[PDB]
Design an enzyme around this catalytic site. Structure first.
Site, PDB file in Angstrom:
ATOM      1  N   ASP E  21       0.453  -1.158  -0.500  1.00 51.82           N
ATOM      2  CA  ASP E  21      -0.717  -0.047   0.022  1.00 51.82           C
ATOM      3  C   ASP E  21       0.518   1.303  -0.070  1.00 51.82           C
ATOM      4  O   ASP E  21       0.605   2.003   1.004  1.00 51.82           O
ATOM      5  CB  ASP E  21      -1.615  -0.198   0.841  1.00 51.82           C
ATOM      6  CG  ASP E  21      -2.345  -0.858   0.849  1.00 51.82           C
ATOM      7  OD1 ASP E  21      -2.922  -0.686   0.152  1.00 51.82           O
ATOM      8  OD2 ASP E  21      -2.834  -1.696   1.662  1.00 51.82           O
ATOM      9  N   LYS E  24       0.711   2.253  -5.565  1.00 49.85           N
ATOM     10  CA  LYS E  24       1.166   0.870  -7.057  1.00 49.85           C
ATOM     11  C   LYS E  24       0.612   0.981  -8.203  1.00 49.85           C
ATOM     12  O   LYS E  24       0.805   0.614  -9.700  1.00 49.85           O
ATOM     13  CB  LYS E  24       2.196  -0.519  -6.751  1.00 49.85           C
ATOM     14  CG  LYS E  24       3.226  -0.157  -6.162  1.00 49.85           C
ATOM     15  CD  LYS E  24       4.210  -1.676  -5.121  1.00 49.85           C
ATOM     16  CE  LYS E  24       3.263  -2.819  -4.309  1.00 49.85           C
ATOM     17  NZ  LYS E  24       3.158  -1.545  -2.548  1.00 49.85           N
ATOM     18  N   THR E  25      -0.676   1.186  -8.060  1.00 54.51           N
ATOM     19  CA  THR E  25      -1.192   0.623  -8.815  1.00 54.51           C
ATOM     20  C   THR E  25      -1.590   2.025  -9.361  1.00 54.51           C
ATOM     21  O   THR E  25      -1.676   2.335 -10.762  1.00 54.51           O
ATOM     22  CB  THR E  25      -3.210   0.268  -8.264  1.00 54.51           C
ATOM     23  OG1 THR E  25      -3.115  -0.784  -6.851  1.00 54.51           O
ATOM     24  CG2 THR E  25      -4.091  -0.475  -8.540  1.00 54.51           C
ATOM     25  N   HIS E  84       0.532  -7.329  -0.882  1.00 54.40           N
ATOM     26  CA  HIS E  84      -0.285  -8.274  -0.009  1.00 54.40           C
ATOM     27  C   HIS E  84       0.715  -9.016   0.552  1.00 54.40           C
ATOM     28  O   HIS E  84       0.951 -10.419  -0.223  1.00 54.40           O
ATOM     29  CB  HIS E  84      -1.609  -8.312  -0.039  1.00 54.40           C
ATOM     30  CG  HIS E  84      -2.127  -9.254   0.781  1.00 54.40           C
ATOM     31  ND1 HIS E  84      -3.530  -9.750   1.345  1.00 54.40           N
ATOM     32  CD2 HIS E  84      -2.069  -8.931   2.363  1.00 54.40           C
ATOM     33  CE1 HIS E  84      -3.882 -10.015   2.368  1.00 54.40           C
ATOM     34  NE2 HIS E  84      -3.059  -9.397   3.035  1.00 54.40           N
TER      35      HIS E  84
HETATM   36  N1  LIG Z   1      -1.510  11.549  -0.856  1.00 55.13           N
HETATM   37  C1  LIG Z   1      -1.197  10.532  -1.063  1.00 55.13           C
HETATM   38  N2  LIG Z   1      -1.975   9.318  -1.539  1.00 55.13           N
HETATM   39  C2  LIG Z   1      -2.378   8.399  -2.214  1.00 55.13           C
HETATM   40  C3  LIG Z   1      -0.939   8.398  -3.190  1.00 55.13           C
HETATM   41  N3  LIG Z   1      -0.805   7.396  -4.120  1.00 55.13           N
HETATM   42  C4  LIG Z   1      -1.838   7.135  -3.763  1.00 55.13           C
HETATM   43  N4  LIG Z   1      -2.524   6.952  -2.858  1.00 55.13           N
HETATM   44  C5  LIG Z   1      -4.112   5.947  -2.352  1.00 55.13           C
HETATM   45  O1  LIG Z   1      -2.718   5.188  -1.795  1.00 55.13           O
HETATM   46  C6  LIG Z   1      -3.458   4.183  -1.899  1.00 55.13           C
HETATM   47  C7  LIG Z   1      -3.022   2.383  -2.104  1.00 55.13           C
HETATM   48  O2  LIG Z   1      -3.364   2.262  -3.960  1.00 55.13           O
HETATM   49  P1  LIG Z   1      -2.511   1.146  -4.583  1.00 55.13           P
HETATM   50  O3  LIG Z   1      -2.151   1.760  -6.197  1.00 55.13           O
HETATM   51  O4  LIG Z   1      -3.563  -0.117  -4.264  1.00 55.13           O
HETATM   52  O5  LIG Z   1      -1.041   0.562  -3.314  1.00 55.13           O
HETATM   53  P2  LIG Z   1      -0.527  -0.428  -3.959  1.00 55.13           P
HETATM   54  O6  LIG Z   1       1.488   0.112  -3.688  1.00 55.13           O
HETATM   55  O7  LIG Z   1      -0.585  -0.841  -4.895  1.00 55.13           O
HETATM   56  C8  LIG Z   1      -0.730  -2.571  -2.872  1.00 55.13           C
HETATM   57  P3  LIG Z   1      -0.329  -3.069  -3.193  1.00 55.13           P
HETATM   58  O8  LIG Z   1       0.467  -3.317  -1.421  1.00 55.13           O
HETATM   59  O9  LIG Z   1      -2.149  -4.551  -2.632  1.00 55.13           O
HETATM   60  O10 LIG Z   1      -0.010  -3.724  -4.429  1.00 55.13           O
HETATM   61  C9  LIG Z   1      -5.075   4.421  -2.011  1.00 55.13           C
HETATM   62  O11 LIG Z   1      -6.159   5.260  -1.061  1.00 55.13           O
HETATM   63  C10 LIG Z   1      -4.837   5.720  -3.139  1.00 55.13           C
HETATM   64  O12 LIG Z   1      -5.703   6.301  -3.724  1.00 55.13           O
HETATM   65  C11 LIG Z   1      -0.437   9.444  -3.266  1.00 55.13           C
HETATM   66  O13 LIG Z   1       1.010   9.430  -4.579  1.00 55.13           O
HETATM   67  N5  LIG Z   1      -0.241  10.654  -2.628  1.00 55.13           N
END
Ligand SMILES: Nc1nc2c(ncn2[C@@H]2O[C@H](COP(=O)(O)OP(=O)(O)CP(=O)(O)O)[C@@H](O)[C@H]2O)c(=O)[nH]1
Ligand SMILES: *C(=O)[C@@H](N)CCCC[NH3+]
EC number: 3.6.5.3
Lengths: 61, 205, 82, 85, 392
Positions: E21, E24-25, E84
């Site tokens: 989290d 990355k998505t 995860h």
């Molecule tokens: N302030 C801020 N919040 C962000 C940023 N990027 C994402 N968020 C939020 O963080 C959360 C995680 O998004 P996600 O893109 O799934 O993450 P991940 O890193 O792929 C997670 P996994 O570990 O399961 O693969 C969402 O709530 C997204 O809107 C950023 O650059 N800044």
RNA sequence: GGGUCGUUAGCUCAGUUGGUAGAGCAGUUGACUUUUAAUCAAUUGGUCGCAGGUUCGAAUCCUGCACGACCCACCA
RNA sequence: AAUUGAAGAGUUUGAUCAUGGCUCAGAUUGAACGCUGGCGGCAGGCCUAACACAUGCAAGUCGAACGGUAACAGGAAGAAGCUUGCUUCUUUGCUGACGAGUGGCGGACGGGUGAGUAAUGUCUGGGAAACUGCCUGAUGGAGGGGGAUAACUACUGGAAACGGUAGCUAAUACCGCAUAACGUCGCAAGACCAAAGAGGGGGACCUUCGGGCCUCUUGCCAUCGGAUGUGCCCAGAUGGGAUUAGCUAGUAGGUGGGGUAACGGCUCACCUAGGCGACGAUCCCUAGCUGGUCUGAGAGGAUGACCAGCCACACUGGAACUGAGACACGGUCCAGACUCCUACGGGAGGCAGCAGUGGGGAAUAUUGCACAAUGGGCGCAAGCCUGAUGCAGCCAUGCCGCGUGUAUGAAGAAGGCCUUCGGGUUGUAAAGUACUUUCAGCGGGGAGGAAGGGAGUAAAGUUAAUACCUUUGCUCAUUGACGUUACCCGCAGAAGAAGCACCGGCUAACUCCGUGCCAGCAGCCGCGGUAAUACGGAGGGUGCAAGCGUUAAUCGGAAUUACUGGGCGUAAAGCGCACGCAGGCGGUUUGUUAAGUCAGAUGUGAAAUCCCCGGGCUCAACCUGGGAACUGCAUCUGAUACUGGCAA
């Protein structure tokens, strides 16, 4: 219901198998056999003769 | 296809030698002949009815080296012919190319004769044949395709072949070493030691 | 329409065109009114290799049996005088 | 279905509005003859038939009718009125 | 299916990894968002990636998603890796498919143990080309915090053997990069500049016979069994037949169509992430771990010899020792098969923090090759680093 | 690919505040009987599926791996 | 020359002979499974789900019917740079040609499946109340006019699908008129009906300079035909069950009207009250049918996947249109279900076409190549389309051929195995040795399947013509998916190619050890409770062979459903007995009739396949020529004893 040829299978509760014909005429009521060398049913271990039946491969070494 | 195994084992098995080990030294004797076909060749067989029918069938088939499925075709072929199937079969079991090659004198053994047919060593009536099971017609001219002429074997074969019985329904050049085939085989000139009525019962059952 | 055409019998790589008179629309090896002669593309040098009764053909020509090209080529090949 | 013969799909639809129309007046002229037969007037049907006879055989060659049904149309209807007149 | 694919520019398998989290998505969604204005093939949204049911059920990446894009110079077959814990094992398949690991860790999060799990696995699989992206940097405008976390990165890269002395760091934020706000999309462009910068063009292993560890196989509608995955070494083309090596007893399989990102590849080759349809094979038999080898090139080995580094508690692993007979799972470029620690004579105990070596007793007969460096996990946690010495 | 519940002498199946696991069906050991049934007692027998860990201590809990019966899938 | 052809055994009892079941020994197959596996030729390859389907392809062609030219390439009025003729280029249907559209033709063929169908089907042989595109024979016409519309443009509904309205315009599209016959109605007289032009070339004459005009090829329209195909009908034959005995009311027939291409309850109105059925009606179950295939001495029995014909169907049910012909696989409409797309208003989809997928299952294959050859479609031709076909790929599935080597070889070895430890056996087998190389593998040559067609040209027809077109040769270039072909040549060197079943008897071929009514064997009788030729291993031996076994199903053996060709005193089986309808059998004499019967002939019995006799593949399998046969059926002519009918 069918007979299980050889001296040892590895089947239990499931272990899907294949059925061929033939009655044993020894334990009447059973008119089918089981195929050693088929599905989950392996071949009878340590067979050096008549291994066409019982699904036993040729001894490599 | 061919037996290619211990080819004299059958000699002890059928008692009478099958001319398999003719080659050079016709003096067989090196197998404790007639008394030891196996680990228990000491026993005496009761040899039943089906036994004598089979033992003869093998003896005939094993002499020419034919195989059962084809030999079965030879029976039905001898049966479809007019006349006595017995004589009809002895013809078919004689008209085999390699056998004709052997009968001319081209060959120390019947099997070595097949090795020639296999290795293009033969040319009959202007045609080189590989078919060992070739049904040579009466009065044809079997010769040798030059690349395999007297290559240490043909001469080696004809050398002992001069002590052969030399069948009547054929001729040989022997100068150019060419087989001069003549009329078809006939009961008197051929075998006369085997029994033909036995095998006809074998396929009746 | 009725046509005079081959029928392609024999085996693989060793064809034997069966010149025959059939109901044009039917199959190559399908039904036909009657067979007439034949053709062999590989018997060029032997006793035969091309047979055909030009008599029955003319009988059908008078009925309108449109001869197919390859067969028409055969009539010229069985020579109008040879 | 996708096929350039979809033209044949719509041409059939095109020709049928034409064909039905042709048969429409044709069958009514036959009905115009029966009206006279149900009228008993020897002249009416004779006038009606002389009216429909040329209009019916005209359809036979057009491919609308198989000319035998048309022949039957000419036949019995006349066989009715000559027997009546 | 459609579109005959052309091998235009060299591919570079990249992906998003780090502690669970960090964005990355959205980042992967933003990567394609950027080049959409300059290059044709890009522009993949958040939901364009978040298509898996459970991946939607959390809003986090769990199923290994895939996208396509590239710079005006070189190609990039991206790997949307999961973060995860359970799926970190499933990101290893993508990590062992990746040419360049981009360490995605937010500046407001800091290098964690789940971060260091992905890190040891990275080097122990074969990846030396690493650039780093820091996310969520809009939160902490305290630059003092950034230079200590950056310090931690170069130390950690040195800690699990990565060139931190040559690793560019991008203190960006991909959310505003996906907001359409060009400024943070420009922060991504800063890394887009680094995209062609740090990673050069690697070697294409076409010369040697075909070889390929399986990544994904699906029940393709109207075609059947299509195996996907980057080629280990060698090439292929539609009409040639290779052999399926792996846990099962080896046999044939024919190339009945080769494709790349739903775009018809004319001829397969080493490195290029390919999707290939196979003749005769069914979905059941084939799965990850096996190998698509050019016939008769691999002996179906049963065991082998290797050395295993052991992480201590703080190192992310063993908080207590072990010994001979221990059963961990050795990951062979895509696999998860139990490689039991069978230490020969004398070594009958191993404490947390050793580099113990032993001839292994593998559970399954897998396609083995001497000299393979493999990353090891055990019971839901990583236990260290490995390197193949000999193979039985 | 993921997530919940399961595996007991050689076999059917037990044992919740975690304190050192049970018969019934096999046999073996003697008479009886051509040899068995009937008849009798002594009696080995699980390495509590495999691996490490939490605790002083694990059939009990922590996950994983082999392998099952279930819920979503993913869709070159 | 054309069927010269038929086997038994083990098992009831203390034992025997009977009847009698039972089981094996044989062969076969779309086979599957297991052990195993070198190659090639030729065939077959979803019988389970007639379950659902992503992708591509499977039916288009004609400019020699027409309006047009949106493309591509030329000519040309013009054009632009500047090497003023080297290029550039806006226009133009004037051409070669061509999207979309009008129309003619085909899409009713070929291809697939066997669900349904017990008779609206098929097989066989007859019959009359039929129609028939294209092909082809003959006789004639082929005049002269009109009104719309598609395309194309404008506006416009709609997500899309898919339209709406207003103008443009042609024809072999469409509609009148003229003219009609041996054509249609009618006994007859009379009444009445058709259409279409184009294309090549061309001297003269003639040009409102479109061409009129000449000539030939092709096409159109009508009638009679034939050929062909199809529809329709009669009788017979065409599974099982009687624990299905009465069935039915357009049902059985008449008459009149109508309807179909044609007769008919095909459909109506009314009258009559019948018609089918134990020589099986209706009903229920299963199932496509035959030629043929396996087997059988034959008769029969079983069966009918493939190859061919006929029938039926196309997601389900039904309907109708275009049309020679479908009441239609890749056509239309409705209604339903199952799916797909959506802007949720509304539409779209039918692999039982070739491949392929999921799935079902014991199990059966590539989303390959080409239109080179045959066939079909359209076209004047050239050509274009062709998942028909021809070929390659995958599978030992079957059939057949070949190879895995030959020869020499006694220390009669090693070791295995038994042993009367004397030795025998394995075992000329091996090693060693002298030759050889088939098939593969690698390196080069090279048949035949190819006929034609193109262009140019010569000559015989054509005609005003030396022009065009038709017929027959010549010439050059050539046209092959297979195809790194078949075959031939050469190279290293026995080098790379044999396993599988059984051994008590049945049934070919044996011992020792291990195990002890335990473990196991098996098709049958039955073996194992301490010395097993019946279990498990080893050695030996036998069978068979790129296959060997097992299960499955079929027939044979089975004269254990017996017409051929069986039985009832007691083994199974005489109704408890008698009369008696239909049905079956019938003394003897003459005559007659000729239904059965037999002879002869004719038509037919499709071919292929089966048989005989030849040929071509290196042989065989296979392909294949001619004959024979298809045991039959209908007609005609004879014999007419025997049986049947009739008379006495
Ligand atoms: N302030 C801020 N919040 C962000 C940023 N990027 C994402 N968020 C939020 O963080 C959360 C995680 O998004 P996600 O893109 O799934 O993450 P991940 O890193 O792929 C997670 P996994 O570990 O399961 O693969 C969402 O709530 C997204 O809107 C950023 O650059 N800044
Ligand atoms: C499908 O997209 C492949 N052909 C491309 C590489 C991705 C494999 N998961």
């Amino acid at each position: 219901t069918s007979y299980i040829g050889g001296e040892g299978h590895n089947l239990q509760e499931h272990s899907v198998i294949l059925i061929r014909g033939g009655r044993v005429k020894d334990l009447p009521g059973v008119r089918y056999h089981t195929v050693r060398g088929a599905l989950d049913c392996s071949g009878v271990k340590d067979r050096k003769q008549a291994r066409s039946k019982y699904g036993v491969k040729r001894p490599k070494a | 296809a061919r037996y290619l195994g211990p080819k004299l084992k059958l000699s002890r098995r059928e008692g009478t030698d099958l001319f398999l080990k003719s080659g050079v030294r016709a003096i067989d004797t090196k197998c404790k002949i007639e008394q030891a076909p196996g680990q228990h060749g000491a026993r005496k067989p009761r040899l039943s009815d089906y036994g004598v029918q089979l033992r003869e069938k093998q003896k005939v088939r094993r002499i020419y080296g034919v195989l059962e499925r084809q030999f079965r075709n030879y029976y039905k072929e001898a049966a479809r012919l007019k006349g006595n199937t017995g004589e009809n079969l002895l013809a078919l079991l004689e008209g085999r190319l390699d056998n004709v090659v052997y009968r001319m004198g081209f060959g120390a053994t019947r099997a070595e004769a097949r090795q020639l047919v296999s290795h293009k060593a033969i040319m009959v009536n202007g045609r080189v044949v590989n078919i060992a099971s070739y049904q040579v017609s009466p009065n044809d001219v079997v010769s040798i395709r030059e690349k395999a002429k007297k290559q240490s074997r043909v001469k080696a074969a004809l050398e002992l072949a001069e002590q052969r019985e030399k069948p009547t329904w054929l001729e040989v050049d022997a100068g150019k070493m060419e087989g001069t085939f003549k009329r078809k085989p006939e009961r008197s000139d051929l075998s006369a030691d085997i029994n033909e009525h036995l095998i006809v019962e074998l396929y009746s059952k | 329409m009725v046509t005079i055409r081959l029928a392609r019998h024999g085996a693989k790589k060793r064809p034997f065109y069966q010149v025959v008179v059939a109901d044009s629309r039917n199959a190559r090896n399908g039904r036909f009114i009657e067979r007439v002669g034949f053709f062999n593309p590989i018997a060029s040098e032997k006793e035969e290799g091309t047979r055909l009764d030009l008599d029955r053909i003319a009988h059908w020509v008078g009925q309108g049996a449109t001869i197919s090209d390859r067969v028409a080529a055969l009539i010229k090949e069985v020579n109008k005088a040879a | 279905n996708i096929k350039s013969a979809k033209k044949r799909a719509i041409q059939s639809e095109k020709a049928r509005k034409h064909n039905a129309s042709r048969r429409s007046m044709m069958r009514t002229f036959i009905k115009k003859v029966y009206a006279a037969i149900e009228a008993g007037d020897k002249a009416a049907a004779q006038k009606a038939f002389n009216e429909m006879q040329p209009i019916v055989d005209r359809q036979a060659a057009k491919g609308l009718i198989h000319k035998n049904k048309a022949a039957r149309h000419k036949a019995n209807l006349t066989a009715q009125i000559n027997k009546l007149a | 299916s459609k579109e005959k694919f052309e091998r235009t520019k060299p591919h570079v398998n990249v992906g998003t990894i780090g502690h669970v989290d960090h964005g990355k998505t959205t980042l992967t969604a933003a990567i394609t968002t950027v080049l959409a204005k300059t290059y044709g093939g890009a522009a993949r949204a958040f939901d364009q990636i978040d298509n898996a049911p459970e991946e939607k059920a959390r809003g986090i990446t769990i199923n290994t998603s895939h996208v396509e894009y590239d710079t005006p110079t070189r190609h990039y077959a991206h790997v949307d890796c999961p973060g995860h814990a359970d799926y970190v094992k499933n990101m290893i398949t993508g990590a062992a498919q990746m040419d360049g690991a981009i360490l995605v860790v937010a500046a407001t999060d800091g290098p964690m143990p789940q971060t260091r799990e992905h890190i040891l696995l990275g080097r122990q699989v074969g990846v030396p080309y690493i650039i780093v992206f820091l996310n969520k940097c809009d939160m902490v405008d305290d630059e003092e915090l950034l230079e200590l976390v950056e310090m931690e990165v170069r130390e950690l890269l040195s800690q699990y053997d990565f060139p931190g002395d040559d690793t560019p760091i991008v203190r960006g934020s991909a959310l505003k990069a996906l907001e359409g706000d060009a400024e943070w999309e420009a922060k991504i462009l800063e890394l887009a500049g680094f995209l062609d910068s740090y990673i050069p063009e690697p070697e294409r292993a076409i010369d040697k016979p075909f070889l390929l560890p399986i990544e994904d196989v699906f029940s393709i509608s109207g075609r059947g069994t299509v195996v996907t995955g980057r080629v280990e070494r060698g090439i292929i083309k539609v009409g040639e037949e290779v052999e399926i090596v792996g846990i099962k007893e080896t046999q044939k399989s024919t190339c009945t169509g080769v494709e790349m990102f739903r775009k018809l590849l004319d001829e397969g080759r080493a490195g290029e992430n390919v999707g290939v349809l196979l003749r005769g094979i069914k979905r059941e038999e084939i799965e990850r771990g096996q190998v698509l080898a050019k016939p008769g090139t691999i002996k179906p080995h049963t065991k082998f010899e290797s050395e295993v580094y052991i992480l201590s508690k703080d190192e992310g692993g063993r908080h207590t020792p072990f010994f001979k007979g221990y059963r961990p799972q050795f990951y062979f470029r895509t696999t998860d098969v139990t490689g039991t620690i069978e230490l020969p004579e004398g070594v009958e105990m191993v404490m947390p923090g050793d580099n113990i070596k032993m001839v292994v007793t593998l559970i399954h007969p897998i396609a083995m090759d001497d000299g393979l460096r493999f990353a090891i996990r055990e019971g839901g946690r990583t236990v260290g680093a490995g390197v193949v010495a000999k193979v039985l």
